[PDB]
């Protein structure tokens, strides 16, 4: 994804939604201390998100499911 973003756009299907999803994942990996799902090789948190999206490991539904599961875990720790 260091040159083009065609594959990620094809996976997501829309160019304007891709930026939002990638920014969400990048901010998760930057200020949230989450581990990347692919082996990074001297990469920033934006190219890592784009390369994760290329593989089909990240999209809106997956992020929403992960957030809901983590909130359920927070509830379980709370009770």
């Amino acid at each position: 994804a260091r040159v083009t973003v065609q594959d990620a756009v094809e996976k997501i299907g829309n160019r304007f939604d891709l930026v939002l999803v990638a920014a969400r994942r990048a901010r998760q990996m930057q200020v949230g201390g989450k581990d990347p799902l692919v082996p990074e090789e001297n990469d920033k948190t934006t190219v890592i998100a784009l390369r994760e999206i290329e593989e089909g490991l990240i999209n809106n539904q997956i992020l929403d499911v992960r957030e809901r599961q983590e909130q359920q875990e927070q509830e379980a720790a709370e009770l």
Partner: protein, 247 residues
């Protein structure tokens, strides 16, 4: 010394430069001959004979040069001055024809067409076609890159509108006019435009929070309201007209 692009000659229609090049080469050639007559101590007779033959060349020129009125010291100093090339004068609308240039090239033992065979400096291989080589008079204009280069990350801002000053002497920022805004709208980059409008120019608290977050390795903005808009509201209110935000 300098390599230029041929394609720039026909599209600009300034053919004269090419002509100058040819004539320039001719001039240099003459100098070389004279220089050769000085490295080896040729006597003054052959020197003055060749110089007179060079000066008499032309098709009914208006200049008569007679070297028999010159003492040998004067002839030698003239040859010393001419050893680097004989200067040539061509009036604006009474210049030198192509035939005279070709004759002068013949006198200096150079190809008449004005093109020689060059070789590649990296591979030693001859270029496939003859190339035009000559001497041209180059100038250095007063636009030095030492003056143009400029950059700024943060500096002083205007007192009323709280926007960065303008100019290299004021250590200012680059203007982002209406047309650049139109281009960014055409692209669809709303976040780039929003951070161009608030956190880089006018959001007084936005600038500080953005700087603090950048230092902390957290890239995120919390935009507010530009101060110029509040100035506009005050200026409209000073006209006796009530304008306000609501809800």
């Amino acid at each position: 010394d300098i390599v230029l692009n041929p394609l720039g000659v026909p599209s600009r229609m300034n053919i004269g430069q090419i002509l100058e090049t040819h004539l320039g080469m001719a001039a240099k050639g003459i100098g070389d001959k004279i220089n050769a007559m000085l490295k080896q101590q040729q006597e003054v007779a052959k020197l003055r004979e060749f110089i007179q033959r060079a000066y008499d060349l032309g098709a009914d020129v208006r200049q008569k040069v007679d070297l028999s009125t010159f003492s040998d010291e004067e002839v030698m100093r003239l040859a010393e001055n001419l050893r680097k090339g004989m200067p040539i004068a061509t009036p604006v609308f009474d210049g030198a024809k192509e035939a005279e240039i070709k004759e002068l090239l013949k006198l200096g033992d150079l190809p008449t067409s004005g093109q020689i065979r060059l070789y590649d400096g990296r591979t030693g291989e001859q270029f496939e076609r003859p190339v035009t080589v000559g001497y041209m008079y180059m100038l250095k204009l007063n636009h030095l890159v030492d003056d143009k280069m400029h950059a700024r990350s943060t500096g002083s801002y205007s007192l009323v509108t709280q926007q960065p000053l303008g100019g290299k002497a004021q250590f200012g920022g680059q203007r982002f006019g209406e047309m650049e805004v139109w281009a960014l709208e055409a692209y669809g980059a709303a976040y780039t435009l929003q951070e161009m409008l608030t956190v880089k120019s006018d959001d007084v608290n936005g600038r500080t929070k953005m700087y603090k977050n950048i230092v902390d390795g957290n890239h995120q903005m919390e935009p507010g309201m530009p101060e110029s808009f509040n100035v506009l509201l005050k200026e409209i209110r000073s006209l006796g007209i009530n304008i306000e935000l609501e809800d």
